């Protein structure tokens, strides 16, 4: 339920091929940018950083949970379906 990891903008690269190492079975790669993650304070900072480095980018809008109406008293309604059968 913690939300502390949904507060900063992140830049990550497109995932590339990983393959099995014949000796040990380890996951091998040829992608030098496979672990690169950059943190940004604003969407506009991240866009600016990608553009000067010549990287094509896709930007997705931040999703905030919608405000909700919580009423503990609704659990005991006279005539509504919100009445809970158990506690």
């Amino acid at each position: 339920s913690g939300v502390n990891n949904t507060k900063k903008w992140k830049m990550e690269f497109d995932t590339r091929e990983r393959w099995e190492n014949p000796l040990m079975g380890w996951a091998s790669t040829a992608d030098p940018l496979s672990n690169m993650v950059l943190t940004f304070s604003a969407k506009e900072d991240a866009i600016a950083f990608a553009e000067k480095n010549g990287w094509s980018y896709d930007v997705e809008e931040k999703k905030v949970p919608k405000p909700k109406s919580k009423s503990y008293g609704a659990n005991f309604s006279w005539n509504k379906r919100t009445r809970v059968s158990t506690k």
Binding site: S77, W78, N79, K80, R81, R83, S85
Partner: protein, 44 residues
């Protein structure tokens, strides 16, 4: 004046398993019509 030397709550010695729910059944005729929430249930 009342005797007030014996115990006058002795009827309960003759109660049985269904005494309470027989009185409840007997008392149904006097009750007033119940209110309604408008639905058959909260839908279980």
């Amino acid at each position: 004046p009342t005797d007030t030397t014996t115990y006058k709550n002795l009827q309960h010695h003759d109660y049985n398993t269904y005494t309470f729910l027989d009185l409840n059944l007997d008392l149904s005729k006097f009750r007033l019509p119940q209110p309604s929430s408008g639905r058959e249930s909260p839908r279980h």
